[PDB]
Every structure is written in structure tokens, then in C-alpha cells.
Scaffold this active site. Structure first.
Site, PDB file in Angstrom:
ATOM      1  N   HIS A 176      25.164  28.243  42.219  1.00  0.00           N
ATOM      2  CA  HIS A 176      23.623  27.844  41.333  1.00  0.00           C
ATOM      3  C   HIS A 176      22.379  28.866  41.887  1.00  0.00           C
ATOM      4  O   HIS A 176      21.496  28.736  41.706  1.00  0.00           O
ATOM      5  CB  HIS A 176      23.690  26.487  41.207  1.00  0.00           C
ATOM      6  CG  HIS A 176      23.640  25.666  42.700  1.00  0.00           C
ATOM      7  ND1 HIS A 176      22.178  25.846  43.510  1.00  0.00           N
ATOM      8  CD2 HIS A 176      24.307  24.803  43.344  1.00  0.00           C
ATOM      9  CE1 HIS A 176      22.351  25.586  44.594  1.00  0.00           C
ATOM     10  NE2 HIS A 176      22.831  25.347  44.804  1.00  0.00           N
ATOM     11  N   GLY A 225      16.532  23.306  50.910  1.00  0.00           N
ATOM     12  CA  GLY A 225      17.129  24.705  51.264  1.00  0.00           C
ATOM     13  C   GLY A 225      18.501  24.057  52.040  1.00  0.00           C
ATOM     14  O   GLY A 225      19.144  24.959  52.667  1.00  0.00           O
ATOM     15  N   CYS A 276      21.336  23.587  50.702  1.00  0.00           N
ATOM     16  CA  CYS A 276      22.738  24.206  50.007  1.00  0.00           C
ATOM     17  C   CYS A 276      23.131  25.148  50.565  1.00  0.00           C
ATOM     18  O   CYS A 276      22.744  26.474  51.573  1.00  0.00           O
ATOM     19  CB  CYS A 276      22.007  24.668  48.428  1.00  0.00           C
ATOM     20  SG  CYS A 276      21.785  22.907  47.578  1.00  0.00           S
TER      21      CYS A 276
END
Ligand SMILES: NCc1ccc(-c2ccccc2)nc1
Ligand code: NA
Lengths: 305, 305
Positions: free
Chosen positions: B41, B143, B145
């Protein structure tokens, strides 16, 4: 979201851990530049544990009596000196993995990460807090002495603790990286008792502020309290007295959530008399005191939920 | 003595964290050999996230559309592919810090360490457990991820988890390192709810054995029970069913403490029906279920890496 007892990444400390062997005793040492720091009681023998004359024991040691082992490489000691309760072994090689570091002596209530090591190699990493009685509730076994506590603000590793011994109550005592013990303990195996432990009140208040930032408010109330009336109640629950310094430190968390510090203090007073009534705060049925106001700001968001 | 929620040393994993930027989205990536793994993503605009056709958007992206920063030196992407829900970015340089590693998928109730990172820089580490509802109760902000979960057995790091998204209840969901999500979740901005979590029964018993090893014995009793009778009680208090292999796994802890697993289940049954009666167990007023039997054995024996 979420709130875990987070420790700093231990990578910069793992590259500094070595194994120090003197006689039949083996513990861990911290290798920074060309110096290896370890507890001085590595030079004690079996009968040198109750009243060791460290100056007398050290003057009988030559450099080759210290076996320093970094992984499988064997460091050669080219000098040694004692500073309070830590040994500083000068080695031939500067540690190429030495990070941006410094030594700091922390105060009770401060938190730090512990890298539990055995035989020079790291076993795990967890978060601790210097208790008001100057001990720490760690996870240490035999051979863990020399393990270090640290904080990594920005890219600088601030070493603040080195494990030396375990008290009969199952708690642990150590020194800063300059050899000065935390609390009234000495590196002797004579039976010593840590003072009665109290709860770090400023850390609990900040932890309640962390719960409000993450969206939990069930514990608040419409009441306030004077600073003196709070301490009169808190000490009856074995809580550290709350000072004006602590009230100031909680300011930024107060401004972010919109709850005055003394209003949070009244909510804590209520929590102490009521408990939590089957509920939890940030995933625990106790009031946690190992998150400083600094820890909460770093871990939590800048916008309240 | 002592028992803390301990995480693995993050050193070997810290050397694999990079920053991956595609457009305005910047998250973390795992640099192993000459491939950087990151959530797929990262290519999604906030507009695409509502209903994305990932392959449709990936053909339009290209190697230059992926800025991979390793520390403060730039990595050149020479190829990009997709495996399930993770993006594989072929880079021009193999990571010299690539450790001995594996990609494994864990079961619910299994624990692991999480290295929370931001902009490719690791900022914290903590121990998690794969909840029975396949979520994790992590501590993540914007952030994070691409933060990875991992375990260590000898010198091999088994990567088991990669963070993708946060659920509206504050818990987190992610995939294994092969892109297979943990639980009934998808990587898109839609209504997704975490199922009603349950308590990992085998971990509670392990944590109860750890309490006995540390001298906490007030919850022990003279009674035992059967696997049938306990699983009825376990089902009524939303505890996971205890299986025969769960008891065999607790075998060594039953012999070390002299307390049979069904003997311990009687203690846990009484603790469920009557509560802790004002006392605590290993400093907790709750029944901790994020220590596997191995985690207990490892921390109570000093296994290093
Ligand atoms: N009750 C045994 C014993 C002996 C010595 C000490 C001690 C503590 C601090 C400094 C100097 C001596 N404490 C307890
Ligand atoms: Na029992």
C-alpha cells in the site's frame, strides 16, 4: 495507538558487549573505544565476597590475568584501573562498533532499557525504572553482572546503569558507568536490605495522561485538589511525594489533553480509594509507574483522541 | 530472579531497516540480500486506498518511483514485483548486514519481538503476541508501517510479521513476510473490525509456572481437574481451549516445579471463579497471556544469542 512498555533498540549496545573472565569468575563487560568496563567484583575469589579489599586484590593482578573475549576474538589487556566500583580494562583494540555514547547518572523514577547478557552475548532487552529505593526490578540470572542499562535519545547511547548484584528480596542494585552505586548499597555479599519501595507518582500521572491521549477517560472526575492534600492521601498508599517540579514537568501533557495537573491528581486520588472496579487502563489492572512524562510524549501522539 | 516482558536483541534486524518512499507516502522496508520488502500500500494514494487495484497501480509505477534510503545513502531500485500484500523491490546492492534469517508464519498465541521504526530508523522494541483474533496489541504511530516482527532461535532471525494497518479499536494487523495477512483483514480503507479476542490459556499457565519459579505460590491449591472439566470453565471465561499438546509443551515446567498442568489448571480455574483476592502475581493484577512456555523456560535459564 496502543501503549507498550517499549525499550530502545539494543543494536548499538550489542556491539559493545564482551565477556570478562578473571580466575574462575565470568561476567559481562562494556567495550567502548579501547576501554572495557565491568564490575570490580570480578576480581573477588570465593572468600573475598563479604569484605573484599578491592585495592589489595587489584594490586596483585597483572594485565594477562584478565581474559577479555569479544565474540571469538580475544582482546589483549594493556592496562587496568579502578574507578569506584567498576573496573576499566585498557585493551589493545578500539571497538569499531563504538557508537555515539556518554555516561549519565539518572535519578529515581527515570526509565531505561536493559540488555541482559550472559557470557558476553545478549539474551534479551526490556525496560526498567530506577525505583525510589534506588533498586531496579530486572530479570537477571547468575552471570548477568556487567549488563548495562541505557537510553538512546537521538543517536546517542546514554549509559546509566551496570548490574552488580541481586538483593535478597529479588530486586537488583548497580552503579552508573563511573562506578558510583545507586543507593546505599556496596559491592559486598553481606546481607543488605533495600528501603521500602514507593510508587513513582509523577510517572503514574503521566501514564494516566497517556490513557487520555489514547482515548480513555473513565477514571476522570469533576474534582480538583491542592498539591498538599494530594500528597497527604498519596503517602497513605506508599506513593512518592509529588513536588512542584513534577507538576511543572506534567505541564505539556496537561496542555495537550486539556486536564490540569491537579485535576489529574484528584482522579488519581479517586483511583487509589476505589480501584478500577473490574476495568483496566491501557491494558493493566494496576497503576503503572514505569512510564516517565518524557516516555509518554515520545511514545504517544501529538494530537489527542 | 525477576521476570520481565523481554524482547529479542534487535541488533540483527536494525541493520535491515530502510526508508521506502513512493510519492508522498514514506514507510519502512526490510532490506535482505538485494531485495527490500515493504507493504504494497506504499504505492497507494489516499484516494486509491478506498478501493485499490494493486496490480493496476503497480504497472504504472516503476523502479525510479521508489526512493529507498538506507541510513543516509541512496539505494537504486533495479526491479519491482509483488507477492500477495508485500512489495518486493529489487535493489542494486546486497545488504552487507543481512543476517542468517528465515521467513516463517506463526500461530495465534505465539509471541515475537517488534522493532517499531519511523522513516527507516528503528525507535523502539517490544514483545508482542499473535492474539487469537489474529491482531496484535502493538504501539504504532504514523510512519510505523513496515515495522517487522521477528524471533531468534540460535543465530537465525525468523521474520514472522510486517505491520500494515491499525484497527479502529487501537489494535494492529499485518502480514507475514510473504504477504499473507494474519487474520480476516485486507489492506484497504474500509470498515474492518477485530473479532472478540480471547485469552491464550497455555500462555497463562506458562506465566503461572514462571511465577512459581520466582517464589509466587499463593495461588497453588491441593486440587486437580480434567481436561474436559477445565475446558468447560475455559469456554465460559472466554479462554482458548487447552489441548493435549498444550499440556505436553508445559511438560518440562510441570516437572521443574512439581505442579501438574491439570493441577495448575485447578489453580487457574479457582483464579477465574474467585479472582486474585487482592493479591498480585509477578507484579500483575491480571492473568498475563503473552509468555509462551518457551519464553518462560528461556528467561528462567539465560539463553543468549
Ligand atoms: N547487616 C549486614 C550489613 C553489613 C554492612 C552493611 C553496609 C551497608 C552500606 C555501607 C556499609 C556497610 N549493611 C549491612
Ligand atoms: Na493446584
Amino acid at each position: 495507538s496502543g501503549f507498550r512498555k517499549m525499550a530502545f533498540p539494543s543494536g548499538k549496545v550489542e556491539g559493545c558487549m564482551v565477556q570478562v573472565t578473571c580466575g574462575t569468575t565470568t561476567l559481562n563487560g562494556l567495550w567502548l573505544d579501547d576501554v572495557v568496563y565491568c564490575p570490580r567484583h570480578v576480581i573477588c575469589t570465593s572468600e573475598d565476597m563479604l569484605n573484599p579489599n578491592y585495592e589489595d586484590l587489584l594490586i596483585r593482578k597483572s594485565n594477562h590475568n584478565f581474559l577479555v573475549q569479544a565474540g571469538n576474538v580475544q582482546l589483549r589487556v594493556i592496562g587496568h584501573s579502578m574507578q569506584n566500583c567498576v573496573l576499566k580494562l585498557k585493551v589493545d583494540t578500539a571497538n569499531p562498533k563504538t557508537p555515539k555514547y556518554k555516561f549519565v547518572r539518572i535519578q529515581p523514577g527515570q526509565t531505561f532499557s536493559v540488555l541482559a547478557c550472559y557470557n558476553g552475548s545478549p539474551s534479551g532487552v526490556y525496560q526498567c525504572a530506577m525505583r525510589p529505593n534506588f533498586t531496579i526490578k530486572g530479570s537477571f540470572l547468575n552471570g548477568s553482572c556487567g549488563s548495562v542499562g541505557f537510553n538512546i535519545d537521538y543517536d546517542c547511547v546514554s549509559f546509566c546503569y551496570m548490574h552488580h548484584m541481586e538483593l535478597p528480596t529479588g530486586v537488583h542494585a548497580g552503579t552508573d558507568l563511573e562506578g558510583n552505586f545507586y543507593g546505599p548499597f556496596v559491592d559486598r555479599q553481606t546481607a543488605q536490605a533495600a528501603g521500602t519501595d514507593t510508587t513513582i507518582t509523577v510517572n503514574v500521572l503521566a501514564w494516566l495522561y497517556a490513557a487520555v491521549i489514547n482515548g480513555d477517560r473513565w477514571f476522570l472526575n469533576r474534582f480538583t485538589t491542592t498539591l498538599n492534600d494530594f500528597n497527604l492521601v498519596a503517602m497513605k498508599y506508599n506513593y512518592e511525594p509529588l513536588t512542584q517540579d513534577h507538576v511543572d514537568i506534567l505541564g505539556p501533557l496537561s496542555a495537550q489533553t486539556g486536564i490540569a495537573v491537579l485535576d489529574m491528581c484528584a482522579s488519581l486520588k479517586e483511583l487509589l480509594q476505589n480501584g478500577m472496579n473490574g476495568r483496566t487502563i491501557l491494558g493493566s489492572a494496576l497503576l503503572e509507574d514505569e512510564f516517565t512524562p518524557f516516555d509518554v510524549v515520545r511514545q504517544c501522539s501529538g494530537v489527542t483522541f
